[PDB]
Design an enzyme around this catalytic site. Structure first.
Site, PDB file in Angstrom:
ATOM      1  N   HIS A  12       0.847  -1.192   0.000  1.00  0.00           N
ATOM      2  CA  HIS A  12       0.000   0.000   0.000  1.00  0.00           C
ATOM      3  C   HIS A  12       0.890   1.253   0.000  1.00  0.00           C
ATOM      4  O   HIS A  12       1.895   1.327   0.696  1.00  0.00           O
ATOM      5  CB  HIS A  12      -1.008   0.011   1.162  1.00  0.00           C
ATOM      6  N   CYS A  66      -0.019   2.061  -5.571  1.00  0.00           N
ATOM      7  CA  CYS A  66      -0.939   3.027  -6.156  1.00  0.00           C
ATOM      8  C   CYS A  66      -0.487   4.452  -5.870  1.00  0.00           C
ATOM      9  O   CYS A  66       0.196   4.708  -4.889  1.00  0.00           O
ATOM     10  CB  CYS A  66      -2.373   2.758  -5.722  1.00  0.00           C
TER      11      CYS A  66
END
Ligand SMILES: FC(F)(F)c1nccc(N[C@H]2CC[C@@H](Nc3ccnc(C(F)(F)F)n3)CC2)n1
Lengths: 368, 357
Positions: B78, B127
């Site tokens: 993440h 991301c």
């Protein structure tokens, strides 16, 4: 790869009213215009634009980009980088300047993407330091994965970009004509800058790219009805007035000639072509220019074109004349009408004047 | 071109306590480690790190760097991008999290530049969307112009780096990473491979950000031995990084003989296997759930390794939390119950005592 068209907008800001003046944009915008013309690009080269003019040049430039069109934007002038975002500073910007006064390059990017372009290249020849005065930090609903955007910054973030070329154009002009993928080409120019004794530890070019195809500035152009509107408009954009001979009452004949320096910068020159042997002192000079143009009446009628602020040297034009540079053709809203003055001696100096109308030259023909 | 050394730190975060769990980092960190080892890189590959552990690992990686050293950071997990900066989210991050919970990549790069590194490569497999809970505006210290920085982003800014087996970025990176091409040129061909492929074109695009001004490649040869009080510290620290316990034979009072074996999977992940007998009483900091231990196959422990690569298997995946020696019991039940305690020191990354920072 194929390009639908290849269009470029080059902006060079030097004469700031509230900020220090620059030198490099003049040589770099001129030299880049020539190399891009050699690559079959339709190029618009603009010097010293206000915020109003810069916004209108970028907006009209977008209303030319089409699906598959390779668009290139080059900027040389005062700039800054705040939190990832780049801003180009217009010549009329106040002291201090904020983002509402300047043009955000990220805003230009997204508007080009809405035209489905085939390649978007941004060459930002400016400083990338933070602007302490900018209270706002714009957060864009950024990105659309078009995989066709290449950014070539003259320097790295938080660093400076230092009749001669700037460091970026010096190295870039030596390879721009090569048949290589634009990212590969920019990377090789970075290696060239790296080899230079001068730049070591001060200036390094930074490339940010999302290009996923072998696209180069050397790609051939493939026609549509919409393309003919920009093809016709671009043909009308660079028409120069024809050299005209003016016959005076005393026998003196003068040649009045014109040269293009930029899309908005023109050189006007006067030459005495015939002089009756009876006349010894003979001078011809231009006056009564439209106030919109804001021409310095002293930076007119110079013995050499260099004295007018021109890129063009004496040996680049018809020689032994008087030169006048009109650098703000974008501000012309009416026809270019002015007076040609003739002063001559055979005790009293004798004056005679003739009014000349040369229409709307270069970018002024594009009624904006 | 020549390199002083080639050092890599690979972090793969999957077991998030308060966020969706990930899958690809395990296969991608394992395979990137093997590729970088073929290029003679000193690789430190770690899975599932807390904020405290990632800061400690970055400080251990930075001690392996010196002037002219090729430094590489690969992160999969993440992440987020705010105001130009990329943050790496640790597995213990709360929901919601802020910048003080994460590690900023630019902060690591700034530390690497203080080491006078010859090349700095960051391969960010995460991301790039904004974290709407991070109100923090970067200061920020304007980085030195070192002209040797290459970022390889798995996706474009404001887009997701979704997974489908390898993740998309590593699938394309694997075919190209071994080539004798300048890292910027190599990364650029990977971006063309992703654009050429039908199922990735339009959905995900690589982004390359670079100021590298020299022809430096991950395939460059390493220069001869450096003789200094700095190279003697750096090498005697690397020589202790991946020490694996030697296979031991245990004899019981009933006459049974058990072979205890060990295998490295990651810098902080080791498999223990017993052949003729179950293992128990592992140190509490390791957090070894007895329900996951002593599996008939290594695939049941969650290992990258399969039966063919190597009894009962136990996966010890948190070696970085081992603060004292690894002491455990080998229990033997027969038809009744006998036990034998075993001490195997501090295996793999545990011998480095990263908790020191
Ligand atoms: F800045 C300013 F002078 F104040 C100014 N005011 C108003 C408009 C304006 N438009 C600019 C300059 C003229 C350009 N016209 C065309 C036409 C066809 N093809 C091309 C191209 F070459 F780009 F392909 N360009 C469009 C951008 N600029």
């Amino acid at each position: 790869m194929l390009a639908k068209d290849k269009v470029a907008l080059l902006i060079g800001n030097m004469n700031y009213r509230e900020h220090p003046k620059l030198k490099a944009p003049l040589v770099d915008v001129y030299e880049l215009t020539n190399l891009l013309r050699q690559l079959d690009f339709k190029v618009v080269s603009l010097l010293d634009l206000t915020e109003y003019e810069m916004r209108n040049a970028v907006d009209e430039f977008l209303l030319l980009l089409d699906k598959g069109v390779y668009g290139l934007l080059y900027y040389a002038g005062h700039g800054y980088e705040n939190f990832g975002n780049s801003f180009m500073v217009p010549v009329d910007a106040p002291n201090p300047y904020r983002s509402e006064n300047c043009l955000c390059v990220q805003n230009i990017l997204k508007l080009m993407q809405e035209k489905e372009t085939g390649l978007n290249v941004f060459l930002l020849d400016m400083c990338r330091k933070r602007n302490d005065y900018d209270d706002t930090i714009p957060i864009l609903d950024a990105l659309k994965v078009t995989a066709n955007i290449v950014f070539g910054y003259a320097t790295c973030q938080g660093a400076e970009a230092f009749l001669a070329n700037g460091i970026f154009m010096k190295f870039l002009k030596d390879r721009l004509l090569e048949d290589k993928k634009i990212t590969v080409l920019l990377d090789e120019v970075a290696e060239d800058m790296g080899k230079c004794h001068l730049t070591k530890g001060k200036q390094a070019l930074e490339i940010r790219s999302s290009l996923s195809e072998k696209r180069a500035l050397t790609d051939p152009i493939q026609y549509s009805a919409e393309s003919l509107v920009r093809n016709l408009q671009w043909a009308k954009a660079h028409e120069l007035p024809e050299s005209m001979c003016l016959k005076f009452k005393c026998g003196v004949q003068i040649q009045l000639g014109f040269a293009a320096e930029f899309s908005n910068v023109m050189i006007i020159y006067t030459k005495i072509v015939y002089k009756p042997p009876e006349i010894i002192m003979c001078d011809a000079y231009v006056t009564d220019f439209p106030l919109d143009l804001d021409i310095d009446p002293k930076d007119a009628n110079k013995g050499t074109p260099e004295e007018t602020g021109s890129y063009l040297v004496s040996k680049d034009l018809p020689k032994a004349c008087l030169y006048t540079r009109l650098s703000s053709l974008q501000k012309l809203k009416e026809e270019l009408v002015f007076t040609v003055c003739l002063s001559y001696q055979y005790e009293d100096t004798v004056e005679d004047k003739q009014e000349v109308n040369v229409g709307k030259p270069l970018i002024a023909k594009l009624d904006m």
